[PDB]
C-alpha atoms as a PDB file:
ATOM      1  CA  UNK A   1      -0.006  -0.041   0.032  1.00  0.00           C
ATOM      2  CA  UNK A   2       1.012   3.578  -0.324  1.00  0.00           C
ATOM      3  CA  UNK A   3      -0.289   7.002   0.783  1.00  0.00           C
ATOM      4  CA  UNK A   4       0.036  10.596  -0.310  1.00  0.00           C
ATOM      5  CA  UNK A   5      -0.956  13.847   1.004  1.00  0.00           C
ATOM      6  CA  UNK A   6      -0.372  17.517   0.389  1.00  0.00           C
ATOM      7  CA  UNK A   7       0.954  19.502   3.111  1.00  0.00           C
ATOM      8  CA  UNK A   8       0.297  23.476   3.449  1.00  0.00           C
ATOM      9  CA  UNK A   9       1.811  26.292   5.059  1.00  0.00           C
ATOM     10  CA  UNK A  10      -0.161  27.587   7.958  1.00  0.00           C
ATOM     11  CA  UNK A  11       0.798  31.131   7.373  1.00  0.00           C
ATOM     12  CA  UNK A  12       2.968  33.328   4.883  1.00  0.00           C
ATOM     13  CA  UNK A  13       6.043  32.560   6.574  1.00  0.00           C
ATOM     14  CA  UNK A  14       5.949  28.656   6.531  1.00  0.00           C
ATOM     15  CA  UNK A  15       6.022  28.582  10.386  1.00  0.00           C
ATOM     16  CA  UNK A  16       4.581  25.166   9.810  1.00  0.00           C
ATOM     17  CA  UNK A  17       2.977  22.754   7.709  1.00  0.00           C
ATOM     18  CA  UNK A  18      -0.414  20.965   8.319  1.00  0.00           C
ATOM     19  CA  UNK A  19      -1.596  17.680   6.740  1.00  0.00           C
ATOM     20  CA  UNK A  20      -5.017  16.603   6.723  1.00  0.00           C
ATOM     21  CA  UNK A  21      -5.826  13.387   8.432  1.00  0.00           C
ATOM     22  CA  UNK A  22      -8.729  10.924   8.648  1.00  0.00           C
ATOM     23  CA  UNK A  23      -9.432   9.649  12.106  1.00  0.00           C
ATOM     24  CA  UNK A  24     -12.403   7.360  13.090  1.00  0.00           C
ATOM     25  CA  UNK A  25     -15.672   6.250  11.692  1.00  0.00           C
ATOM     26  CA  UNK A  26     -17.146   8.005   9.974  1.00  0.00           C
ATOM     27  CA  UNK A  27     -13.971  10.015   9.252  1.00  0.00           C
ATOM     28  CA  UNK A  28     -13.332  13.163  11.287  1.00  0.00           C
ATOM     29  CA  UNK A  29     -10.598  15.115   9.325  1.00  0.00           C
ATOM     30  CA  UNK A  30      -8.244  17.055  11.414  1.00  0.00           C
ATOM     31  CA  UNK A  31      -5.100  19.275  10.060  1.00  0.00           C
ATOM     32  CA  UNK A  32      -1.941  17.914  12.012  1.00  0.00           C
ATOM     33  CA  UNK A  33       1.455  18.988  12.132  1.00  0.00           C
ATOM     34  CA  UNK A  34       3.625  16.026  10.831  1.00  0.00           C
ATOM     35  CA  UNK A  35       6.773  16.144  13.042  1.00  0.00           C
ATOM     36  CA  UNK A  36       9.704  13.918  12.404  1.00  0.00           C
ATOM     37  CA  UNK A  37      11.243  15.193  15.464  1.00  0.00           C
ATOM     38  CA  UNK A  38       8.758  13.527  17.954  1.00  0.00           C
ATOM     39  CA  UNK A  39       6.660  10.266  17.959  1.00  0.00           C
ATOM     40  CA  UNK A  40       3.027  11.089  19.680  1.00  0.00           C
ATOM     41  CA  UNK A  41       0.010  11.315  17.539  1.00  0.00           C
ATOM     42  CA  UNK A  42      -2.023  13.802  19.467  1.00  0.00           C
ATOM     43  CA  UNK A  43      -5.149  15.907  18.743  1.00  0.00           C
ATOM     44  CA  UNK A  44      -7.416  18.687  20.135  1.00  0.00           C
ATOM     45  CA  UNK A  45     -10.709  16.717  21.246  1.00  0.00           C
ATOM     46  CA  UNK A  46     -13.888  16.830  23.108  1.00  0.00           C
ATOM     47  CA  UNK A  47     -11.871  16.241  26.159  1.00  0.00           C
ATOM     48  CA  UNK A  48      -9.849  19.258  25.849  1.00  0.00           C
ATOM     49  CA  UNK A  49     -10.271  21.958  28.567  1.00  0.00           C
ATOM     50  CA  UNK A  50     -12.403  24.051  26.952  1.00  0.00           C
ATOM     51  CA  UNK A  51     -10.752  27.370  27.820  1.00  0.00           C
ATOM     52  CA  UNK A  52      -7.750  25.835  25.940  1.00  0.00           C
ATOM     53  CA  UNK A  53      -9.453  25.362  22.630  1.00  0.00           C
ATOM     54  CA  UNK A  54      -9.606  28.438  20.097  1.00  0.00           C
ATOM     55  CA  UNK A  55     -11.011  27.491  16.912  1.00  0.00           C
ATOM     56  CA  UNK A  56      -9.215  24.172  16.370  1.00  0.00           C
ATOM     57  CA  UNK A  57     -11.145  21.127  14.947  1.00  0.00           C
ATOM     58  CA  UNK A  58     -11.360  18.588  17.648  1.00  0.00           C
ATOM     59  CA  UNK A  59     -11.635  14.776  17.726  1.00  0.00           C
ATOM     60  CA  UNK A  60     -14.732  13.561  19.314  1.00  0.00           C
ATOM     61  CA  UNK A  61     -14.109   9.732  20.243  1.00  0.00           C
ATOM     62  CA  UNK A  62     -17.803   9.282  21.233  1.00  0.00           C
ATOM     63  CA  UNK A  63     -18.730   9.833  17.715  1.00  0.00           C
ATOM     64  CA  UNK A  64     -16.417   7.180  16.323  1.00  0.00           C
ATOM     65  CA  UNK A  65     -17.803   3.797  16.026  1.00  0.00           C
ATOM     66  CA  UNK A  66     -14.192   2.551  15.804  1.00  0.00           C
ATOM     67  CA  UNK A  67     -12.888   4.535  18.876  1.00  0.00           C
ATOM     68  CA  UNK A  68     -11.695   2.581  21.821  1.00  0.00           C
ATOM     69  CA  UNK A  69     -10.204   3.921  25.062  1.00  0.00           C
ATOM     70  CA  UNK A  70      -6.886   2.603  25.715  1.00  0.00           C
ATOM     71  CA  UNK A  71      -7.814   1.843  29.349  1.00  0.00           C
ATOM     72  CA  UNK A  72      -5.345   3.273  31.975  1.00  0.00           C
ATOM     73  CA  UNK A  73      -2.993   4.875  29.449  1.00  0.00           C
ATOM     74  CA  UNK A  74      -1.988   8.559  29.558  1.00  0.00           C
ATOM     75  CA  UNK A  75       0.593  10.632  27.838  1.00  0.00           C
ATOM     76  CA  UNK A  76       2.642  14.113  28.285  1.00  0.00           C
ATOM     77  CA  UNK A  77       5.036  15.742  26.173  1.00  0.00           C
ATOM     78  CA  UNK A  78       7.157  18.896  26.210  1.00  0.00           C
ATOM     79  CA  UNK A  79       8.608  20.184  23.112  1.00  0.00           C
ATOM     80  CA  UNK A  80      11.928  21.776  22.400  1.00  0.00           C
ATOM     81  CA  UNK A  81      10.178  25.387  22.316  1.00  0.00           C
ATOM     82  CA  UNK A  82       8.718  25.031  25.508  1.00  0.00           C
ATOM     83  CA  UNK A  83       5.262  23.719  24.393  1.00  0.00           C
ATOM     84  CA  UNK A  84       3.136  20.818  25.948  1.00  0.00           C
ATOM     85  CA  UNK A  85       0.339  18.664  26.033  1.00  0.00           C
ATOM     86  CA  UNK A  86      -1.018  15.917  27.965  1.00  0.00           C
ATOM     87  CA  UNK A  87      -4.289  13.514  28.188  1.00  0.00           C
ATOM     88  CA  UNK A  88      -5.503  10.141  27.697  1.00  0.00           C
ATOM     89  CA  UNK A  89      -5.312   7.661  24.744  1.00  0.00           C
ATOM     90  CA  UNK A  90      -7.949   5.957  22.232  1.00  0.00           C
ATOM     91  CA  UNK A  91      -7.136   3.427  19.334  1.00  0.00           C
ATOM     92  CA  UNK A  92      -9.107   4.175  16.291  1.00  0.00           C
ATOM     93  CA  UNK A  93      -8.658   3.951  12.708  1.00  0.00           C
ATOM     94  CA  UNK A  94      -6.199   6.590  10.990  1.00  0.00           C
ATOM     95  CA  UNK A  95      -5.670   7.326   7.208  1.00  0.00           C
ATOM     96  CA  UNK A  96      -3.343   9.539   5.581  1.00  0.00           C
ATOM     97  CA  UNK A  97      -3.490  10.368   1.813  1.00  0.00           C
ATOM     98  CA  UNK A  98      -5.477   7.048   1.049  1.00  0.00           C
ATOM     99  CA  UNK A  99      -3.028   5.026   3.610  1.00  0.00           C
ATOM    100  CA  UNK A 100      -5.124   3.336   6.496  1.00  0.00           C
ATOM    101  CA  UNK A 101      -3.745   1.976  10.066  1.00  0.00           C
ATOM    102  CA  UNK A 102      -6.132   0.150  12.434  1.00  0.00           C
ATOM    103  CA  UNK A 103      -5.749   0.485  15.849  1.00  0.00           C
ATOM    104  CA  UNK A 104      -3.479   3.548  15.817  1.00  0.00           C
ATOM    105  CA  UNK A 105      -2.956   5.344  19.138  1.00  0.00           C
ATOM    106  CA  UNK A 106      -4.710   8.404  19.028  1.00  0.00           C
ATOM    107  CA  UNK A 107      -3.463  10.341  22.023  1.00  0.00           C
ATOM    108  CA  UNK A 108      -6.191  12.915  23.224  1.00  0.00           C
ATOM    109  CA  UNK A 109      -5.559  15.933  24.589  1.00  0.00           C
ATOM    110  CA  UNK A 110      -6.987  17.007  27.887  1.00  0.00           C
ATOM    111  CA  UNK A 111      -4.662  20.144  28.370  1.00  0.00           C
ATOM    112  CA  UNK A 112      -2.641  22.182  26.006  1.00  0.00           C
ATOM    113  CA  UNK A 113       0.167  25.201  26.423  1.00  0.00           C
ATOM    114  CA  UNK A 114      -0.825  28.405  25.292  1.00  0.00           C
ATOM    115  CA  UNK A 115       1.225  28.191  22.051  1.00  0.00           C
ATOM    116  CA  UNK A 116      -1.154  25.539  20.814  1.00  0.00           C
ATOM    117  CA  UNK A 117      -4.276  27.229  21.933  1.00  0.00           C
ATOM    118  CA  UNK A 118      -3.204  30.239  19.971  1.00  0.00           C
ATOM    119  CA  UNK A 119      -2.493  28.634  16.897  1.00  0.00           C
ATOM    120  CA  UNK A 120      -5.919  27.795  15.533  1.00  0.00           C
ATOM    121  CA  UNK A 121      -4.671  26.338  12.316  1.00  0.00           C
ATOM    122  CA  UNK A 122      -2.885  23.374  13.837  1.00  0.00           C
ATOM    123  CA  UNK A 123      -5.336  20.839  15.642  1.00  0.00           C
ATOM    124  CA  UNK A 124      -2.712  18.409  16.689  1.00  0.00           C
ATOM    125  CA  UNK A 125       0.679  16.511  15.963  1.00  0.00           C
ATOM    126  CA  UNK A 126       1.488  13.506  13.946  1.00  0.00           C
ATOM    127  CA  UNK A 127       4.649  12.072  15.186  1.00  0.00           C
ATOM    128  CA  UNK A 128       7.270  10.353  12.724  1.00  0.00           C
ATOM    129  CA  UNK A 129      10.430   9.893  14.969  1.00  0.00           C
ATOM    130  CA  UNK A 130      11.178   6.588  16.375  1.00  0.00           C
ATOM    131  CA  UNK A 131       8.760   4.895  18.433  1.00  0.00           C
ATOM    132  CA  UNK A 132      11.050   4.822  21.460  1.00  0.00           C
ATOM    133  CA  UNK A 133      10.305   8.638  22.182  1.00  0.00           C
ATOM    134  CA  UNK A 134       6.510   7.815  22.432  1.00  0.00           C
ATOM    135  CA  UNK A 135       5.091   9.272  25.708  1.00  0.00           C
ATOM    136  CA  UNK A 136       2.354   7.086  26.244  1.00  0.00           C
ATOM    137  CA  UNK A 137       2.518   5.303  29.461  1.00  0.00           C
ATOM    138  CA  UNK A 138       2.608   2.436  30.771  1.00  0.00           C
ATOM    139  CA  UNK A 139       2.541   0.975  27.477  1.00  0.00           C
ATOM    140  CA  UNK A 140       4.411   2.823  24.898  1.00  0.00           C
ATOM    141  CA  UNK A 141       2.846   3.112  21.384  1.00  0.00           C
ATOM    142  CA  UNK A 142       3.986   3.096  17.992  1.00  0.00           C
ATOM    143  CA  UNK A 143       3.849   5.845  15.446  1.00  0.00           C
ATOM    144  CA  UNK A 144       1.789   5.700  12.378  1.00  0.00           C
ATOM    145  CA  UNK A 145       4.647   5.146  10.165  1.00  0.00           C
ATOM    146  CA  UNK A 146       5.738   2.280  12.313  1.00  0.00           C
ATOM    147  CA  UNK A 147       2.242   0.727  12.109  1.00  0.00           C
ATOM    148  CA  UNK A 148       1.916   1.071   8.627  1.00  0.00           C
ATOM    149  CA  UNK A 149       5.388  -0.144   7.404  1.00  0.00           C
ATOM    150  CA  UNK A 150       5.000  -3.743   7.075  1.00  0.00           C
ATOM    151  CA  UNK A 151       1.815  -2.992   4.833  1.00  0.00           C
ATOM    152  CA  UNK A 152       3.973  -0.286   2.771  1.00  0.00           C
ATOM    153  CA  UNK A 153       5.263  -1.084  -0.985  1.00  0.00           C
ATOM    154  CA  UNK A 154       8.494   0.102   0.519  1.00  0.00           C
ATOM    155  CA  UNK A 155       9.339   1.022   4.257  1.00  0.00           C
ATOM    156  CA  UNK A 156       9.784   4.484   3.496  1.00  0.00           C
ATOM    157  CA  UNK A 157       8.053   8.198   3.646  1.00  0.00           C
ATOM    158  CA  UNK A 158       9.368  11.024   2.056  1.00  0.00           C
ATOM    159  CA  UNK A 159       8.929  14.866   2.994  1.00  0.00           C
ATOM    160  CA  UNK A 160       8.602  17.405   0.052  1.00  0.00           C
ATOM    161  CA  UNK A 161       7.941  20.738   1.925  1.00  0.00           C
ATOM    162  CA  UNK A 162       7.253  23.791  -0.479  1.00  0.00           C
ATOM    163  CA  UNK A 163       8.671  27.197   0.148  1.00  0.00           C
ATOM    164  CA  UNK A 164       5.626  29.551   0.314  1.00  0.00           C
ATOM    165  CA  UNK A 165       3.694  26.743  -1.280  1.00  0.00           C
ATOM    166  CA  UNK A 166       2.127  23.149  -0.674  1.00  0.00           C
ATOM    167  CA  UNK A 167       4.106  20.263  -0.963  1.00  0.00           C
ATOM    168  CA  UNK A 168       3.784  16.610  -0.416  1.00  0.00           C
ATOM    169  CA  UNK A 169       4.081  13.670   2.359  1.00  0.00           C
ATOM    170  CA  UNK A 170       4.391  10.313   0.619  1.00  0.00           C
ATOM    171  CA  UNK A 171       4.076   6.896   2.216  1.00  0.00           C
ATOM    172  CA  UNK A 172       5.541   3.509   0.977  1.00  0.00           C
ATOM    173  CA  UNK A 173       7.105   4.992  -2.419  1.00  0.00           C
ATOM    174  CA  UNK A 174       9.633   7.328  -3.862  1.00  0.00           C
ATOM    175  CA  UNK A 175       8.191   9.655  -6.353  1.00  0.00           C
ATOM    176  CA  UNK A 176      11.080   9.888  -9.008  1.00  0.00           C
ATOM    177  CA  UNK A 177       9.167  12.812 -10.807  1.00  0.00           C
ATOM    178  CA  UNK A 178       9.391  14.960  -7.543  1.00  0.00           C
ATOM    179  CA  UNK A 179      13.126  15.332  -7.321  1.00  0.00           C
ATOM    180  CA  UNK A 180      16.185  16.313  -9.706  1.00  0.00           C
ATOM    181  CA  UNK A 181      19.434  14.369 -10.136  1.00  0.00           C
ATOM    182  CA  UNK A 182      19.935  11.589  -7.540  1.00  0.00           C
ATOM    183  CA  UNK A 183      19.101  11.107  -4.088  1.00  0.00           C
ATOM    184  CA  UNK A 184      22.214  10.659  -1.864  1.00  0.00           C
ATOM    185  CA  UNK A 185      21.783   8.558   1.363  1.00  0.00           C
ATOM    186  CA  UNK A 186      23.404   8.911   4.604  1.00  0.00           C
ATOM    187  CA  UNK A 187      23.575   7.084   7.877  1.00  0.00           C
ATOM    188  CA  UNK A 188      21.066   7.575  10.588  1.00  0.00           C
ATOM    189  CA  UNK A 189      21.796   7.090  14.302  1.00  0.00           C
ATOM    190  CA  UNK A 190      18.613   6.090  16.206  1.00  0.00           C
ATOM    191  CA  UNK A 191      20.229   6.122  19.690  1.00  0.00           C
ATOM    192  CA  UNK A 192      18.480   9.489  20.583  1.00  0.00           C
ATOM    193  CA  UNK A 193      15.179   8.349  19.027  1.00  0.00           C
ATOM    194  CA  UNK A 194      15.566  10.975  16.244  1.00  0.00           C
ATOM    195  CA  UNK A 195      16.372  11.004  12.269  1.00  0.00           C
ATOM    196  CA  UNK A 196      20.003  11.810  13.419  1.00  0.00           C
ATOM    197  CA  UNK A 197      22.524  12.208  10.869  1.00  0.00           C
ATOM    198  CA  UNK A 198      25.949  13.736  10.277  1.00  0.00           C
ATOM    199  CA  UNK A 199      26.354  16.669   7.651  1.00  0.00           C
ATOM    200  CA  UNK A 200      29.407  16.923   5.900  1.00  0.00           C
ATOM    201  CA  UNK A 201      29.725  20.608   5.883  1.00  0.00           C
ATOM    202  CA  UNK A 202      28.697  24.201   4.753  1.00  0.00           C
ATOM    203  CA  UNK A 203      29.229  27.014   2.424  1.00  0.00           C
ATOM    204  CA  UNK A 204      27.777  30.561   2.478  1.00  0.00           C
ATOM    205  CA  UNK A 205      26.737  32.163  -0.515  1.00  0.00           C
ATOM    206  CA  UNK A 206      29.180  31.660  -3.213  1.00  0.00           C
ATOM    207  CA  UNK A 207      31.910  30.916  -0.670  1.00  0.00           C
ATOM    208  CA  UNK A 208      34.184  27.817  -0.671  1.00  0.00           C
ATOM    209  CA  UNK A 209      32.813  24.949   0.900  1.00  0.00           C
ATOM    210  CA  UNK A 210      34.070  23.962   4.802  1.00  0.00           C
ATOM    211  CA  UNK A 211      34.382  20.321   5.111  1.00  0.00           C
ATOM    212  CA  UNK A 212      33.369  19.681   8.712  1.00  0.00           C
ATOM    213  CA  UNK A 213      31.200  17.181  10.391  1.00  0.00           C
ATOM    214  CA  UNK A 214      27.887  18.579  11.893  1.00  0.00           C
ATOM    215  CA  UNK A 215      25.500  16.145  13.640  1.00  0.00           C
ATOM    216  CA  UNK A 216      21.911  16.917  13.632  1.00  0.00           C
ATOM    217  CA  UNK A 217      18.299  15.814  13.183  1.00  0.00           C
ATOM    218  CA  UNK A 218      15.977  16.149  10.499  1.00  0.00           C
ATOM    219  CA  UNK A 219      13.048  17.856  12.080  1.00  0.00           C
ATOM    220  CA  UNK A 220       9.816  18.845  10.135  1.00  0.00           C
ATOM    221  CA  UNK A 221       8.295  19.895  13.415  1.00  0.00           C
ATOM    222  CA  UNK A 222      10.904  22.686  13.929  1.00  0.00           C
ATOM    223  CA  UNK A 223      10.761  25.784  11.632  1.00  0.00           C
ATOM    224  CA  UNK A 224      14.422  26.932  11.621  1.00  0.00           C
ATOM    225  CA  UNK A 225      17.733  25.739  10.912  1.00  0.00           C
ATOM    226  CA  UNK A 226      19.629  25.508  14.069  1.00  0.00           C
ATOM    227  CA  UNK A 227      23.543  25.211  13.739  1.00  0.00           C
ATOM    228  CA  UNK A 228      26.634  25.539  15.794  1.00  0.00           C
ATOM    229  CA  UNK A 229      27.467  29.007  16.686  1.00  0.00           C
ATOM    230  CA  UNK A 230      30.465  29.245  14.679  1.00  0.00           C
ATOM    231  CA  UNK A 231      28.554  28.355  11.456  1.00  0.00           C
ATOM    232  CA  UNK A 232      25.647  30.669  12.046  1.00  0.00           C
ATOM    233  CA  UNK A 233      28.026  33.549  12.780  1.00  0.00           C
ATOM    234  CA  UNK A 234      29.997  32.781   9.663  1.00  0.00           C
ATOM    235  CA  UNK A 235      26.629  33.217   7.788  1.00  0.00           C
ATOM    236  CA  UNK A 236      25.346  36.498   9.317  1.00  0.00           C
ATOM    237  CA  UNK A 237      28.722  37.893   8.867  1.00  0.00           C
ATOM    238  CA  UNK A 238      27.947  38.318   5.146  1.00  0.00           C
ATOM    239  CA  UNK A 239      24.797  40.359   5.804  1.00  0.00           C
ATOM    240  CA  UNK A 240      25.375  43.886   6.135  1.00  0.00           C
ATOM    241  CA  UNK A 241      23.929  45.174   9.672  1.00  0.00           C
ATOM    242  CA  UNK A 242      23.055  41.365  10.908  1.00  0.00           C
ATOM    243  CA  UNK A 243      23.314  41.149  14.620  1.00  0.00           C
ATOM    244  CA  UNK A 244      22.376  38.611  17.325  1.00  0.00           C
ATOM    245  CA  UNK A 245      19.826  40.445  19.520  1.00  0.00           C
ATOM    246  CA  UNK A 246      19.243  38.667  23.001  1.00  0.00           C
ATOM    247  CA  UNK A 247      16.070  40.989  23.455  1.00  0.00           C
ATOM    248  CA  UNK A 248      14.842  39.533  20.172  1.00  0.00           C
ATOM    249  CA  UNK A 249      16.056  36.188  21.019  1.00  0.00           C
ATOM    250  CA  UNK A 250      18.462  35.359  17.970  1.00  0.00           C
ATOM    251  CA  UNK A 251      19.971  36.930  14.792  1.00  0.00           C
ATOM    252  CA  UNK A 252      18.074  39.821  13.205  1.00  0.00           C
ATOM    253  CA  UNK A 253      18.919  41.846   9.840  1.00  0.00           C
ATOM    254  CA  UNK A 254      18.007  44.902   7.948  1.00  0.00           C
ATOM    255  CA  UNK A 255      14.663  43.857   6.001  1.00  0.00           C
ATOM    256  CA  UNK A 256      16.484  45.810   3.266  1.00  0.00           C
ATOM    257  CA  UNK A 257      19.236  43.211   2.715  1.00  0.00           C
ATOM    258  CA  UNK A 258      19.494  40.443   0.101  1.00  0.00           C
ATOM    259  CA  UNK A 259      20.288  37.396   1.872  1.00  0.00           C
ATOM    260  CA  UNK A 260      22.943  34.604   0.763  1.00  0.00           C
ATOM    261  CA  UNK A 261      22.219  31.065   0.105  1.00  0.00           C
ATOM    262  CA  UNK A 262      23.313  28.457   2.456  1.00  0.00           C
ATOM    263  CA  UNK A 263      24.811  25.058   1.502  1.00  0.00           C
ATOM    264  CA  UNK A 264      24.893  22.028   3.576  1.00  0.00           C
ATOM    265  CA  UNK A 265      26.485  18.779   2.658  1.00  0.00           C
ATOM    266  CA  UNK A 266      25.081  15.246   2.400  1.00  0.00           C
ATOM    267  CA  UNK A 267      28.097  13.044   1.821  1.00  0.00           C
ATOM    268  CA  UNK A 268      29.526  14.325  -1.507  1.00  0.00           C
ATOM    269  CA  UNK A 269      26.343  15.811  -2.545  1.00  0.00           C
ATOM    270  CA  UNK A 270      25.214  19.495  -1.819  1.00  0.00           C
ATOM    271  CA  UNK A 271      21.756  20.914  -1.055  1.00  0.00           C
ATOM    272  CA  UNK A 272      21.385  24.948  -1.565  1.00  0.00           C
ATOM    273  CA  UNK A 273      18.990  26.712   0.366  1.00  0.00           C
ATOM    274  CA  UNK A 274      18.269  29.761  -1.242  1.00  0.00           C
ATOM    275  CA  UNK A 275      18.489  33.177   0.580  1.00  0.00           C
ATOM    276  CA  UNK A 276      14.840  34.093   0.379  1.00  0.00           C
ATOM    277  CA  UNK A 277      14.031  30.729   2.319  1.00  0.00           C
ATOM    278  CA  UNK A 278      16.118  32.295   5.293  1.00  0.00           C
ATOM    279  CA  UNK A 279      13.796  35.635   5.641  1.00  0.00           C
ATOM    280  CA  UNK A 280      11.165  35.404   8.513  1.00  0.00           C
ATOM    281  CA  UNK A 281       9.966  38.823   7.891  1.00  0.00           C
ATOM    282  CA  UNK A 282       9.841  41.568  10.529  1.00  0.00           C
ATOM    283  CA  UNK A 283      10.106  41.059  13.973  1.00  0.00           C
ATOM    284  CA  UNK A 284       6.835  42.980  14.742  1.00  0.00           C
ATOM    285  CA  UNK A 285       4.655  44.393  12.220  1.00  0.00           C
ATOM    286  CA  UNK A 286       5.907  47.485  10.670  1.00  0.00           C
ATOM    287  CA  UNK A 287       9.437  46.750  11.805  1.00  0.00           C
ATOM    288  CA  UNK A 288      12.395  47.124   9.369  1.00  0.00           C
ATOM    289  CA  UNK A 289      14.333  44.471  11.598  1.00  0.00           C
ATOM    290  CA  UNK A 290      13.895  40.892   9.988  1.00  0.00           C
ATOM    291  CA  UNK A 291      14.202  37.650  11.973  1.00  0.00           C
ATOM    292  CA  UNK A 292      16.945  34.916  10.434  1.00  0.00           C
ATOM    293  CA  UNK A 293      16.061  31.380   9.350  1.00  0.00           C
ATOM    294  CA  UNK A 294      19.578  30.201  10.460  1.00  0.00           C
ATOM    295  CA  UNK A 295      19.981  30.491  14.409  1.00  0.00           C
ATOM    296  CA  UNK A 296      22.439  29.242  16.843  1.00  0.00           C
ATOM    297  CA  UNK A 297      21.906  25.707  18.570  1.00  0.00           C
ATOM    298  CA  UNK A 298      24.010  26.592  21.669  1.00  0.00           C
ATOM    299  CA  UNK A 299      22.133  25.781  24.663  1.00  0.00           C
ATOM    300  CA  UNK A 300      19.519  23.574  22.628  1.00  0.00           C
ATOM    301  CA  UNK A 301      22.114  20.769  23.010  1.00  0.00           C
ATOM    302  CA  UNK A 302      21.396  19.507  19.298  1.00  0.00           C
ATOM    303  CA  UNK A 303      21.629  20.946  15.756  1.00  0.00           C
ATOM    304  CA  UNK A 304      18.318  20.994  13.845  1.00  0.00           C
ATOM    305  CA  UNK A 305      17.720  20.670  10.209  1.00  0.00           C
ATOM    306  CA  UNK A 306      14.277  22.113  10.230  1.00  0.00           C
ATOM    307  CA  UNK A 307      11.983  23.255   7.779  1.00  0.00           C
ATOM    308  CA  UNK A 308      14.197  25.953   6.450  1.00  0.00           C
ATOM    309  CA  UNK A 309      16.655  23.082   5.522  1.00  0.00           C
ATOM    310  CA  UNK A 310      14.305  20.539   4.656  1.00  0.00           C
ATOM    311  CA  UNK A 311      12.133  22.546   2.332  1.00  0.00           C
ATOM    312  CA  UNK A 312      15.357  22.729  -0.099  1.00  0.00           C
ATOM    313  CA  UNK A 313      15.189  19.171  -0.809  1.00  0.00           C
ATOM    314  CA  UNK A 314      13.191  15.976  -1.508  1.00  0.00           C
ATOM    315  CA  UNK A 315      14.032  13.857   1.775  1.00  0.00           C
ATOM    316  CA  UNK A 316      13.478  10.440   2.141  1.00  0.00           C
ATOM    317  CA  UNK A 317      13.293   8.990   5.571  1.00  0.00           C
ATOM    318  CA  UNK A 318      14.267   5.010   4.972  1.00  0.00           C
ATOM    319  CA  UNK A 319      12.862   2.832   7.912  1.00  0.00           C
ATOM    320  CA  UNK A 320      14.405  -0.332   6.600  1.00  0.00           C
ATOM    321  CA  UNK A 321      16.105  -2.409   9.392  1.00  0.00           C
ATOM    322  CA  UNK A 322      18.933  -0.076   9.406  1.00  0.00           C
ATOM    323  CA  UNK A 323      17.248   3.269   8.763  1.00  0.00           C
ATOM    324  CA  UNK A 324      18.813   5.762   6.292  1.00  0.00           C
ATOM    325  CA  UNK A 325      18.167   9.420   5.336  1.00  0.00           C
ATOM    326  CA  UNK A 326      18.203  10.394   1.558  1.00  0.00           C
ATOM    327  CA  UNK A 327      18.603  14.031   0.200  1.00  0.00           C
ATOM    328  CA  UNK A 328      17.948  14.944  -3.434  1.00  0.00           C
ATOM    329  CA  UNK A 329      17.868  18.468  -5.034  1.00  0.00           C
ATOM    330  CA  UNK A 330      14.545  19.449  -6.550  1.00  0.00           C
END
């Protein structure tokens, strides 16, 4: 089997992407944030504290003939940006782009933190990291991909995120029309539960390539590209007027600037992030100071190849017995 679903930016800055997901019988369609950096499928629901729901579409298990309470199971998650959610668990039928899993753990939120409430466009998350990170207790649950894997034509999913445009998540096949050239595959460590890999280096604009190992994660659920302070300093040094602002919380630059591209290495291959992908617009409405899309990972504890990087590529998440990651230009 295979699935194919379109993923759509939530706003004009590509702050995140939502993908429609059918849950239950009859189907309840919720727009979820597919997140290769976490492993819980959780939703706004009929159980969510009412004051914490503001425009989201909710899952109502009592209206699904296939929903079953997973007795005694609870979940609680905290993300790298400080947001969080928790609740209880149902199993139900979940379909993505034509691909159906029965008995999927659907984690129903009783509580969500303010940033979730304030984002009316995201109805929940669908985790696509390794199931070892799933927070359900006392019986850890599998991701949608893990549950689907055996039924897939090939044990893979791909992320093809658009720049200021829709893109695609495919399950079980590689669309050879969706990229140019060849796909370069690179080793993955699952030791931290992430799609963790090592980039072979970087270049800034038309500058020379610096060969250097950069360990990081391919994370569709993080907006920006977070890299070591040395790398980030080298990038922003090429933008006149750019500076790190502690009050804003990262590198800002004059909105009048033309940003250089940023290249990252995948083995001997190179993925080029156009300058425009690195512009996240005015820090506040009307400001001429703009927020940068490449930021330091210092104090995160991990480097993150988030959407800024991933949307420049066609990315294969290969869930074979020994997982790997593939990157192609497009």
